[PDB]
Design a protein around this nucleic acid. Structure first.
Length: 862
DNA sequence: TATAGTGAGTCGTATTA
DNA sequence: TAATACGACTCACTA
């Protein structure tokens, strides 16, 4: 086993040699040097730059060295942070701090001092451990490999891409080990805070801001990028030049996954990755001796897809993103937004200095989001320009606890419109007639034309032939592209399309074309339950037009509103009608007739029901399916001037939640019953074996376990964290006392358990559908390149026709040969429920849906 | 399964120039 | 000897 079985000298060289054996010593050296940038900036890269890191780094290194002197020079307890940091090379501490902090800031929401210090501590710990082997590894690949030039030539422009290595061709010293941290959270945060503290000191890159001082539920301490830097990153070209994300693309095929850890990246002087991202080392260990051939096969095929930077799109991105007025509206503006001038009569205490406190707060909230989106956009550009001339790049892959497949590097194919526009597939093929037809459908989809039949989409592109061509010819002059649904992806399509026009159907195309599942989850529920009516709302049946479940739930909500607008309850006078005197409050019950009228005044369209349908239950909801409707629809309407029809904003929200839930309940009947069934099972599995006085325990709380069709096991185990607070003197100014969740757990969270079972089950379900599709499209048809995004399947034009066929085939096959619900039942039958075992059961009935009809469904991608 | 209420007023402790 | 940093509590929040 790598751990022990080999010497630090052998581990240091074991990857270089093999990476050199194949690929050659130039790429082999580059790939490991690339991986080492996650811990330390090479002296070669840094000094060459004489970009913010040219000031930041030295000012920071110098501060760490001085902090150490101040600590040693005085008597008494040494700060906990020092204990751990004292051993790490300061150049590494400074670089990790800079990079981790800027990365956390690409988050629009969570930048609390906990999140950032936590992320820094984790990375600092990777270096403490692994650092010795990194130092040796670097010394090793600096020296040219031994003789025979043909072997070292490496690349040799062999117009065919590098091929992954064979599993058995991997020395045991490459079988990675230990992806989980071993430091206590208290210490990790201790280290993270001190590092943040020194960064604020040496440079003024960030600052600490107290949010909502006094609110038990919202009080927070957050990191905010300083205006000076926000403006430099926004207005300068390459401000982030030598500050790459912690996880980057590979310049050679990634290491294949053979076990629980160590797959993807090649270096041994790094912290290996985990095959599955779990909540604890223990949970990860469960996969150690599992055996799931199809899972590894799938991850390894996706990982082996070769990509490359789309230079034409990059050239445009690099130029317009620096304009003070970008044609692509979703590019964070460069100028800030001034605070709404006080009413000069602010002293006035009406809801003016209250509504104003809300207006300004909002502006700060958007400015933060604007700075984060900016930082993010710049990381992507720094990475697309870094790899712009490579023949090909690769992305290693991971899986979340439910089995969903994710690319590891920050810049990846699963990103936003721009990022995906910057990426294209490497090995392509002559497009042909069929491939050219789908390239156009992809062009249509990139615009907003996707809820219409294919011939219309095809009609759409042709009618704009000259627009498309003009954009490909002078993108900066003709910005019709920048106005489309997915601008950058639409632009990429325009260059490809123009290519076809110039070279004919023999044109070698590699733009990844994508197929998306309608609604995902309701397709899976409808398919596993064979619900023809539910399946038809998503797109499981061959229809003449595209069905929009969001639109049909909407029409159903509206006919109930028209129903209540005519009849329905009347505005019950003030509350006072169930007691006597005083409390005339709640002077309004607003009958459904008034509630219906308010909503009809507002509108209630597909949009209003869609996002609303998405934030409740399946997705991300936190107590109150209406307490979200009041904040995502009514509130923003009121805040923007409108919303005057909502006299009692809370009751309006309460009323619409019931209509939407009541609408979906009769639209996807079979699916809701399946969710409740899954919920019931979860509640019992998480329950505790009691009894009348003699509350001994026969069965302590249990986690919900189940196995996906392709063989991926998943264990749902939400737990309650054991918290604590640290007491850190911060900048000799005040005591930062952060509340933190410890690595120690107390007891299973019963509520969280049953609230997540349904969405976590369908996700693990689509997760294996995607894996099986990858395997099948690869072995059955000859698909080598894949663009995977949880429910979007893509590849090059000439293979599109078969990919389109493979998602359906794989979908049909899994549900015909597997009764996942019954299989689930046979999992929490024995282990689960002690004696009782009643009230929960009754597997939902199988419907009349013919799964074979999915093979003929045009719009049922996925 | 990625995530965390906050700072001040005090007191008690193992540490260390 | 007597500074040092900071965990463990408790209280009021600028709501």
């Amino acid at each position: 086993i790598a751990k022990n079985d080999f010497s630090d000298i052998e581990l240091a060289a074991i990857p270089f040699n093999t990476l050199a054996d194949h690929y050659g010593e130039r790429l082999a050296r580059e790939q490991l040097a690339l991986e080492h940038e996650s811990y330390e900036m090479g002296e070669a890269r840094f000094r060459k730059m004489f970009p913010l890191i040219t000031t930041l780094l030295p000012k920071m290194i110098a501060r760490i060295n001085d902090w150490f002197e101040e600590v040693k020079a005085k008597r008494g307890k040494r700060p906990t942070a020092f204990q751990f940091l004292q051993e790490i090379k300061p150049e590494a501490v400074a670089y990790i701090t800079i990079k981790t902090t800027l990365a956390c800031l690409t988050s629009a929401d969570n930048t609390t001092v906990q999140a950032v210090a936590s992320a820094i501590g984790r990375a600092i710990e990777d270096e403490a451990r692994f650092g010795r082997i990194r130092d040796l590894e670097a010394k090793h690949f600096k020296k040219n490999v031994e003789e025979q030039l043909n072997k070292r030539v490496g690349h040799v422009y062999k117009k065919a891409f590098m091929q992954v290595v064979e599993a058995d061709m991997l020395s045991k010293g490459l079988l990675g080990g230990e992806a989980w941290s071993s430091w206590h959270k208290e210490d990790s945060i201790h280290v993270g805070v001190r590092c943040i503290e020194m960064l604020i000191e040496s440079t003024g890159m960030v600052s600490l801001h107290r949010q909502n001082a006094g609110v038990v539920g919202q009080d927070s301490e957050t990191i905010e990028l300083a205006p000076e830097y926000a403006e430099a990153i926004a207005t300068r070209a390459g401000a982030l030049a030598g500050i790459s994300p912690m996880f980057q693309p590979c310049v050679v095929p990634p290491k294949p996954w053979t076990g629980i850890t160590g797959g993807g990246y090649w270096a041994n002087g790094r912290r290996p990755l985990a095959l599955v991202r779990t909540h604890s080392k223990k949970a990860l260990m469960r996969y150690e001796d599992v055996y799931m051939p199809e899972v590894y096969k799938a991850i390894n095929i996706a990982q082996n897809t070769a990509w490359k930077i789309n230079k034409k799109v990059l050239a445009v991105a690099n130029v317009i993103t620096k304009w003070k007025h970008c044609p692509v509206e979703d590019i964070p503006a460069i100028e800030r937004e001034e605070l709404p001038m006080k009413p000069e009569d602010i002293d006035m205490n009406p809801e003016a200095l209250t509504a104003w406190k809300r207006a300004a707060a909002a502006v700060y909230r958007k400015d933060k989001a604007r700075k984060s989106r900016r930082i993010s956009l710049e990381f992507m550009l720094e990475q697309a320009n870094k790899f712009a001339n490579h023949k090909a790049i690769w992305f290693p892959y991971n899986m979340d606890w439910r089995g969903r497949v994710y690319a590891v590097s920050m810049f990846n194919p699963q990103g936003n419109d721009m990022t995906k526009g910057l990426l294209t597939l490497a090995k392509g093929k002559p497009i042909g007639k069929e491939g050219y037809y789908w390239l156009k459908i992809h062009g249509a989809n990139c615009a907003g034309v996707d809820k219409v039949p294919f011939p219309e989409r095809i009609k759409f592109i042709e009618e704009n032939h000259e627009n498309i061509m003009a954009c490909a010819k002078s993108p900066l002059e003709n910005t019709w592209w920048a106005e489309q649904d997915s601008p950058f992806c639409f632009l990429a399509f325009c260059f490809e399309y123009a290519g076809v026009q110039h070279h004919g159907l023999s044109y070698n195309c590699s733009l990844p074309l994508a197929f998306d599942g309608s609604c995902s989850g309701i397709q899976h529920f409808s398919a596993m339950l064979r619900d023809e009516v539910g399946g038809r709302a998503v797109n499981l049946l061959p229809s003449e037009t595209v069905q929009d479940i969001y639109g049909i739930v909407a029409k159903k909500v509206n006919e109930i509103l028209q129903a209540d607008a005519i009849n329905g309850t009347d505005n019950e006078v003030v509350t006072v009608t169930d007691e006597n005197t005083g409390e005339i409050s709640e002077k309004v019950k607003l009958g459904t007739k008034a509630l219906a009228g308010q909503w009809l005044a507002y509108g209630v369209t597909r949009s209003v029901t869609k996002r609303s349908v998405m934030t409740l239950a399946y997705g991300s909801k936190e107590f109150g399916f209406r307490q979200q409707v009041l904040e995502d629809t009514i509130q923003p309407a009121i805040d923007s001037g409108k919303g005057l029809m909502f006299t009692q904003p809370n009751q309006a929200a309460g009323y619409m939640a019931k209509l939407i839930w009541e609408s979906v309940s009769v639209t996807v009947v079979a699916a809701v019953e399946a969710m409740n069934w899954l919920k019931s099972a979860a509640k019992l599995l998480a329950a505790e074996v009691k009894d009348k006085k003699t509350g001994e325990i026969l069965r302590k709380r249990c986690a919900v376990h189940w196995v996906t069709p392709d063989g991926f096991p998943v264990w749902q185990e939400y737990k309650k964290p054991i918290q604590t607070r640290l007491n850190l003197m911060f900048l000799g100014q005040f005591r930062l006392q952060p509340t933190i969740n410890t690595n120690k757990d107390s007891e299973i969270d019963a509520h969280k358990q049953e609230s997540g079972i349904a969405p976590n089950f369908v996700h693990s379900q689509d997760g294996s559908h995607l894996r099986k599709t990858v395997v099948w499209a690869h072995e059955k048809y000859g698909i080598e390149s894949f663009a995977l995004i949880h429910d979007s399947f893509g590849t090059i034009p000439a293979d599109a026709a078969n990919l389109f066929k493979a998602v359906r085939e794989t979908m049909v096959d899994t549900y015909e040969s597997c009764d996942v619900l019954a299989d689930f039942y046979d999992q929490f039958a024995d282990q689960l429920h002690e004696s009782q075992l009643d009230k929960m059961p009754a597997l939902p009935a199988k419907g009349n849906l013919n799964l074979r009809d999915i093979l003929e469904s045009d719009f049922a991608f996925a």
